[PDB]
Amino acid sequence: GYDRALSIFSPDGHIFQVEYALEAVKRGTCAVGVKGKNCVVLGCERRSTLKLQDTRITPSKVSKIDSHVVLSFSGLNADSRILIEKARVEAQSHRLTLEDPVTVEYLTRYVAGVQQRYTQSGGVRPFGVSTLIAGFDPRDDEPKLYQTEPSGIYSSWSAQTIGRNSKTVREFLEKNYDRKEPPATVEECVKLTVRSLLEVVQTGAKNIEITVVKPDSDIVALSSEEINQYVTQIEQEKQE
Amino acid sequence: MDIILGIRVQDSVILASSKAVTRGISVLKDSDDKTRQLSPHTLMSFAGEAGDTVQFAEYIQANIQLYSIREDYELSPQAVSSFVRQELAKSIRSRRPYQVNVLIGGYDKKKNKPELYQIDYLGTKVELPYGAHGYSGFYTFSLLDHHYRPDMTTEEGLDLLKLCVQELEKRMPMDFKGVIVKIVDKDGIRQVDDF
Amino acid sequence: TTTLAFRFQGGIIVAVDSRATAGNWVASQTVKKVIEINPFLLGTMAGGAADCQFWETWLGSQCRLHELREKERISVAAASKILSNLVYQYKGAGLSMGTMICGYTRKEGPTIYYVDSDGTRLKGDIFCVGSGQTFAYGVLDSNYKWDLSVEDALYLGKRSILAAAHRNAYSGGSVNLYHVTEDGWIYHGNHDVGELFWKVKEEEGSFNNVIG
Amino acid sequence: GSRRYDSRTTIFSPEGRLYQVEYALESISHAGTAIGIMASDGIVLAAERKVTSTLLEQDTSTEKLYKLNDKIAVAVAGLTADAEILINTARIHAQNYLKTYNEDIPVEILVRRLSDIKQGYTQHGGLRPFGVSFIYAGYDDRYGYQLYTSNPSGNYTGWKAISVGANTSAAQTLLQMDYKDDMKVDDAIELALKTLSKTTDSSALTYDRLEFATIRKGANDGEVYQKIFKPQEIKDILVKTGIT
Amino acid sequence: QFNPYGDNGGTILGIAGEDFAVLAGDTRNITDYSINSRYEPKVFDCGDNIVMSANGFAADGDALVKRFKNSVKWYHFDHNDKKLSINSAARNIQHLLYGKRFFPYYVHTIIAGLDEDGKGAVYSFDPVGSYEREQCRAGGAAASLIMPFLDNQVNFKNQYEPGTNGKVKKPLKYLSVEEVIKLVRDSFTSATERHIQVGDGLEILIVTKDGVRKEFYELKRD
Amino acid sequence: NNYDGDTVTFSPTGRLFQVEYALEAIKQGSVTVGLRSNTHAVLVALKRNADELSSYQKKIIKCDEHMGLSLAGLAPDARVLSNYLRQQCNYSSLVFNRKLAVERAGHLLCDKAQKNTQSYGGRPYGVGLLIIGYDKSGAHLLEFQPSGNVTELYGTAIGARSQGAKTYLERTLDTFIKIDGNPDELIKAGVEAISQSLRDESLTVDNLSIAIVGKDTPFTIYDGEAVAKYI
Amino acid sequence: DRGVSTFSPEGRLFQVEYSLEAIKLGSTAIGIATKEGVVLGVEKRATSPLLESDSIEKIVEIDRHIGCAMSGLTADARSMIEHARTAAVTHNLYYDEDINVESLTQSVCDLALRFGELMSRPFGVALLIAGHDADDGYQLFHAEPSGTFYRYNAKAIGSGSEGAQAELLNEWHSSLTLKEAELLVLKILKQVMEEKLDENNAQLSCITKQDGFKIYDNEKTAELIKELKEKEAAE
Amino acid sequence: TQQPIVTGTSVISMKYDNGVIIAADNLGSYGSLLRFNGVERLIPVGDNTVVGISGDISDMQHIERLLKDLVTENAYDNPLADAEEALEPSYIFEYLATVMYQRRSKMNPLWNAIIVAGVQSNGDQFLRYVNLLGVTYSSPTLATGFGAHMANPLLRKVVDRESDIPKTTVQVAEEAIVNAMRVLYYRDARSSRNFSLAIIDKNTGLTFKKNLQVENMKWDFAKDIKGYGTQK
Amino acid sequence: SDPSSINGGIVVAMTGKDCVAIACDLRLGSQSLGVSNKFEKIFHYGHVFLGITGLATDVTTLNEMFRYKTNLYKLKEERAIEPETFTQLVSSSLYERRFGPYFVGPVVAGINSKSGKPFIAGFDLIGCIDEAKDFIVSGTASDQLFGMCESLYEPNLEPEDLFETISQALLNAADRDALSGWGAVVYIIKKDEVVKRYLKMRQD
């Protein structure tokens, strides 16, 4: 079998293949995660360079791993499918053996472990993908939001963004997100998520996707019109 | 396990399964639920060798739940039954076959039709208006052959099912400790808590 | 062999006899048939002694690895399933096991799983396993209530093993008692059947058939 | 040892691009243009054969349009031999699904499977990727008529109208201009041929340089029919639409 | 058909004292009605103040002892010459035995020594690795002849104090090493009289904090 | 230069640079001395610490009751090779009821190291070993190089500044070989030998490591206050 | 290119030497061994204020009697921790006892040089393994990707290591109490950290014979930080 | 698992004051057919060891080759192959015992009973038994098959315990061995008159005697025996 | 116990003038117990018809297998498989399980689309081809079918006469077999039309 060590250290102590995998994430469309008091919202950028697209069937940016957990990403689209499939299989395997669905942290730890493995296994390259994993632990009402990256490190975030121009939207979130008082309702959380994407997106038309996840496996994706109403209300307050 | 019965009426499928678990000399349990929900509108009951029954049922459950998440779509009862049949047909030529017989009761939301599939451990699948496994059919099929109508209501199906259980309780040597009855229809799966 | 475990208001009572036989020959009267998996989980020995000892000790190692990785006490459901899935892999090879995996957690409360070497895994309120199981069941069934006190529940388990020890030739020696609480199991001593029988006969007025 | 001669086909560039995928896409940009257009009552597949000869046996020739099953077909742009490897794998996958579930494979599931195979060659194995881009035209009872594309990266997307191969920039602009949602198959047939006629590098668009196919519910009642056009039938539709 | 097992007879006996332990065994080795050897050692010093005997099929017995001795050697290599405690040895032997669960060592194993508090310890194993700490254990051919005698004379079973008539048990007073050796010798002398596979010689290994000592006694050779 | 990229490549003058670079790792290692008489064989090793808070890296490893070695270079490689020796000593005892001859132990180490010098993908061992032992032909001392070269000697030294100790042993050859039935005097000669390789630092109680094997002496290692007697 | 298991002309493995450079970029971790226990402390170093710092797990339990702190590419540590935990539990299963801290450390270090063309590269993380056993008492080890492990009375790893080690050189003595060690780790962490030390960007832990391995609460550490500030202002 | 086809009967042996004696007849039986009459079943290894083998002859020939290879292998890179590092009886036995037990553990035994007789470097007598089950034991006298039932009782009358060994000369020991071989010829239906005898002495070394015969046989009394009861 | 007679059932095929007929009963049972009266044992892949008797799980498995293989055949060959070619495919497929066989008795029937020649064939459970000119029989009442066919059959029967002959062969054979019956189907196959007829028969 092909056993070549592609991910190796350089004289300055860097693994360039892992670092170049991050550059693939930088190129990917922007994704953002914001957790309120009783919800988590995942916002995603859709580049409008591709019209004549069939939005019914085109792979959506947010994917359900189980009925209570979701995964969004920035980077190579094909790479993300492999991580999503593995995560979905592990979620069912966990239910089968432990007789309890995965915690959001466990699922994150698994996906992050797969990513790490691909940075020191022979004949493979790292995933050019960073993920945002969000949801609620079984029988728990505390919101969860985690981030993973090609190196395999992961951590919890009150709010986080990944992908292109994520530096800008993180700038926005850092000054607009208050930890002592997070978005108390679904409305406030979605509004702050749409606002953060409007710093980067371009047109607020079909370029913004929003998915709301609530406790007890209550996950719903907002439509164009519902999001368009947020886009309208934000700019009308801005004209002042 | 012992008695598992199925009947497909007008708008639903009804599965009746015995509650007894006997390990040789003693009846260890009298409230055992010999069924698994594979999807919101598909239920599978099972009987056969100890251990293999639950192991097989949960393995199928896990696979259908995986498919549901991947595609964000519920497989038709027919599709699920074909998947289950293949697994059992694969199993019969294995090193150690699953000794498990199943009934699959499902409501097809596309066709708006109830469907009952009977599959034995060899992978022998048949779609039936009513079915059973083991010796259950020997006592009950003469009653079902007489009274069954395709336009029966759920309530009439339950009454015909009671007559079948009464005949079983009369002529069967084994005490199977009554049955748990579940109904599968357009609204999903529910248990009849008084039977 | 006679082993039992039952759920009640105060948790779980586990009671076992102490006799091991090879044919008619009594090999030991001092066998430990409760396996202390960890401070919160107990298992009972019936069928193969080695199979039960080995794999339930192994189970303790798996439970320890779980709580290190997940930073949380393993559920009785998860612990019992690790064992049942393991023995199911070996099905046909000739393992011999009939055990009750007993525990008390926050999310579950007091829980008992009958696990068995042909792959059976059953949750329940009362279980009795072994050659003397039928004798113990009689005493259990006629005297069991959910609202038993810890004191009365302990005695009921003790009395049920005694019933089996008396009638079943392959049960006897001594009775080991355990009380499983949410904060862990508590050992309630070794009780010689010889001394216990006469004590119970006099105090209870039972066993009038036997001259004492 | 052997390391010396390894090109390392599965590595990122400093910019985070996959060298071999990018170079495979460059190869595909020189292949004959293939176009797919989805209508309400069917799908059209149109594709240009590359600079042919008069001695080529056209009626038995197939380099662009392939049948995966009775419901799903593909248009190919790139290395034909590479495409046939993947096509055979897709055909088997469709049959595996049919055997397992006793239902025809949904279009996307087939597309995802082939796309995952392509992806694997970019991440592990140290082999060159498949120099192929597909347009998938198919029907199932969940989403109805569907168009997809996949490329050597293993990325796939859904489309109302799409082109692959040569002059996709020009072709896509022309499609974006004249495509409408309430369009019908007969209109889509005309749009596809007009687009190829304008984007072609040849002097004129003729029947011998084309492969054409339609997927219609124009099959008697509640079923779907695939029609791989014959040379004479391509010649007729060229006259009908007023190109020759 | 090839039978991979045999029976080499022999009887062994382990007794745990207050601050000592003895492991004894006859030195006769047999097949069927023939004597192979009148002196074939069966109880072995395995190092770290542990003595062992694996009675039954001698080939499996020798293999097990050999592998355990090896395990002691590697325990020292892997864990900075740490002394292998009797409880750790017992658990280790369980895994050696259970490793061949489906093709077992056809032996009854007993080890003896001192625990980490300096108290006498004896552990007893079945062929597939189920084990327990015990005060008193006979193994092998004449085990059924010896154990009832030990129940009566070591644990004072069925013995009550004169005058009370069954009301007060005979108290369980501790036995000296000299007292234990007397009971061991009488056990084997009696077993020699009534069991054909027992005889020739008795070898006793005594374990204390000072180390392992040996004693040998003649038994009847008929 | 162009021929040091892997162990599978000869240079134009017939050299193996990766093996030579592995040899260089031994020269960086701390000094260790070996010497023997006709009754005993002794190892003396200067242990190296990382800093004042750290422990002193152990240098001597026991292989059997009658055999052991001291290391200089990559310590993990010594652990691999010593483990292999333990297994081979053990195989000989279990299968043949026979204590492994020291000379045969040297042949086995040579062959194991050789395979890592002729194949692609691998690397040479980066450690030198001094093996002492007492077998059926008396006391023995071996020097192992990761090139594969194993040499039987009366005395030797490997590591940094080992040349000083080696010259001393070359002078003292006629004296220390005759130290029979006197373990303490043989160790003294070894401690005096390793002292010829010291600069700036001297032999302290946690610095010095000594091992001995002989006629009626199992391989035993002395560390801590057990070597204060010889300081 | 060149082999992954190649020796340099100086007799060092290129990849091992390069992994040591990655560890130098890692956040600081400090360990101090006393006769009352071993203390382990780490710099969390959150990349952003929106990152919930209590999810940063750079101190980890291996067993009840063994703890571990990490510095460098921390993702690489996960399989090392998994192996350590398995090794600890497996030995208890085989021998009905706790495993020695050194034997655990040696088992972890056996993974280190299992790379080539096994894993494709060395680990890019260093570990401080602290614990207690009955034979050698309280112990602190430094496990490197070279496969070498040194025992230490006190040790610092990561970006502020040489400055911290010089400080540990002066401060450590054989009569340190557990409380004195706790304050000493906090003091030296504060010295080498970029950001100002508090209970949210630094973490303490210890291993004692009685209570075993314990990660300190942020409330507990906050008090020790306040105790540190006052005693430094005391002169 | 197999069955023995061509077989050799008893091997008998005993210790005496300065060494060991071992003996075995020269027959290779094929069931009840006395097929092969020139089979050597005592195989010397060096000048200090003799391995006596009964049971399956095809397996004996395999073992004979293993021992031959063992001598070759021991000489490799061994300057003291004919001195301090020569093969000992104890090395040869332990090797065979390992092989026998391994083979039975794979359920494919070497269908033999083996006695290794020799003298160690320090002059100690070596005599130990191993068979197809990997069972091993030592005794002042050792015998396989019928020899165990008939030879041992006779040989044990000479050396009944360890303390009798120094009192037993080579002449008395050989005499006892030769008589035992005669008794086996009278009473074992799978024995022959021709046998080999080997003496391994710590002073005089290995003496290997071939083509020995059972002599001084009593048959004359047969003439008087008539009928089976009443016949005169 | 005997896998070929657990479920019961029968298939018969006959040749006529420019036509073939294939017929089967509808019973599926578990030994004595009748389970299904709608278990059809004849399948078709394009214009080639395959009847399969024996163990019902293998009947279903083999149908799915030959649908699988004839679909791939068609995609690659760009034409429907012919009866002669399919017969060889069945034989090859059965023999590849020589030492773990499908417990079945397949029967092929069809007309070659190019030559117009009527074709029938039978197989044993491991693939040995019986290519009879007249008729092929299979199942738990094969003896009975051999008796019926041998007496009732004559060559060159017209489609509507062949229907009567094969129907009466099946029906009367089935009525002398406990494990066959519970309904019957007859296919009458011509070059470009196929008629399917369900027969009325006793239901015991």
Ligand SMILES: [Mg+2]
């Ligand atoms: Mg006797």
Ligand SMILES: [Mg+2]
């Ligand atoms: Mg019939």
Ligand SMILES: [Mg+2]
């Ligand atoms: Mg009938």
